[PDB]
């Protein structure tokens, strides 16, 4: 029985427990023994986990980095030991990686935009609240939304960062609202920003302006069920873990794998 190892950023969040669960079910299904190591959101422990795995002759390393920049050296221990590395959710800035499996953030953003078109109409006047500048999530969600901006002929009144934060989402939306009162819809690159933006619009007496979030968090999905948030984009973390294990399998069977395998996601609306 061959062993596939999974170094997970943390098991303290439901998102990553699903990622582990999806990886476990797929591994069982493909006939592998999955060794799971928790990094406890600490790069030093992640580094120790990868070193432990190298000396125990692991065939492939599935690693969900605690941080893209900090994982560099952990990937390098695996690279030198000749253990193929596959990243999950977060990319590794440095180090040789055979494949990266994450959500299809581009499709996510396009989905959000298509929904805005469905409810606000073609050529709608929209505002976009971006995530932290430089992060891959903000970049990919942004280009996905731009695909919907082109296809649906959206007029983007404003597009500014709110750094994936609820308080900044609130304050930025407040500023943009007064400067662009003709806004018909908002696309926030995470539920925190969307909720922040919702709070801002509620305070100005503008709950007729639809807000679309992203992430499918407990708070985000709750807001959709209450009829506050028009929608959210839920990720499928279990599918990231499953696809990662399957890609490891293809690598172990002597196959050449794609660099990326963007995982599908779903539009969450009321009902």
From Swiss-Prot:
MF (Gene Ontology): monosaccharide binding
CDD domains registered for this protein in UniProt: PBP1_ribose_binding
Biological process according to GO: D-ribose transmembrane transport; positive chemotaxis; transmembrane transport
Annotated localization: Periplasm
Keywords: Chemotaxis, Periplasm, Signal, Sugar transport, Transport
GO cellular component entries: ATP-binding cassette (ABC) transporter complex, substrate-binding subunit-containing; membrane; outer membrane-bounded periplasmic space
Function: Part of the ABC transporter complex RbsABC involved in ribose import. Binds ribose. Also serves as the primary chemoreceptor for chemotaxis.
Summary of subunit composition and partner proteins: The complex is composed of an ATP-binding protein (RbsA), two transmembrane proteins (RbsC) and a solute-binding protein (RbsB).
NCBIfam families on file: PRK10653.1 (NF007936)
Family the UniProt entry places it in: Belongs to the bacterial solute-binding protein 2 family.
Official protein name in the record: Ribose import binding protein RbsB
């Amino acid at each position: 029985k061959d062993t596939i190892a999974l170094v997970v950023s943390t098991l303290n969040n439901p998102f990553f427990v699903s990622l582990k669960d999806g990886a476990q079910k797929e591994a069982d299904k493909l006939g592998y023994n999955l060794v799971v190591l928790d990094s406890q959101n600490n790069p030093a422990k992640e580094l120790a986990n990868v070193q432990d795995l190298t000396v125990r002759g692991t065939k492939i390393l599935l690693i969900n980095p605690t941080d893209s920049d900090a994982v560099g050296n952990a990937v390098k221990m695996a690279n030198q030991a000749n253990i193929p590395v596959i990243t999950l959710d977060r990319q590794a800035t440095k180090g040789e990686v055979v494949s990266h499996i994450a959500s299809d953030n581009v499709l996510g953003g396009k989905i959000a935009g298509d929904y805005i078109a469905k409810k606000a109409g073609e050529g709608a006047k929209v505002i976009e609240l971006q995530g932290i500048a430089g992060t891959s999530a903000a970049r990919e969600r942004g280009e996905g939304f731009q695909q919907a901006v082109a296809a649906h002929k959206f007029n983007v009144l404003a597009s500014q960062p709110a750094d994936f934060d609820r308080i900044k989402g609130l304050n930025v939306m407040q500023n943009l609202l007064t400067a662009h009162p003709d806004v018909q819809a908002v696309f926030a690159q995470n539920d925190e920003m969307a909720l922040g933006a919702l709070r801002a619009l509620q305070t100005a007496g503008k709950s007729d302006v639809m807000v679309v979030g992203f992430d499918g968090t407990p708070d985000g999905e709750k807001a959709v069920n209450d009829g506050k948030l028009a929608a959210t984009i839920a990720q499928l973390p279990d599918q990231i873990g499953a696809k990662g294990v399957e890609t490891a399998d293809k690598v172990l069977k002597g196959e050449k794998v794609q660099a990326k395998y963007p995982v599908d996601l779903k539009l969450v609306v009321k009902q």
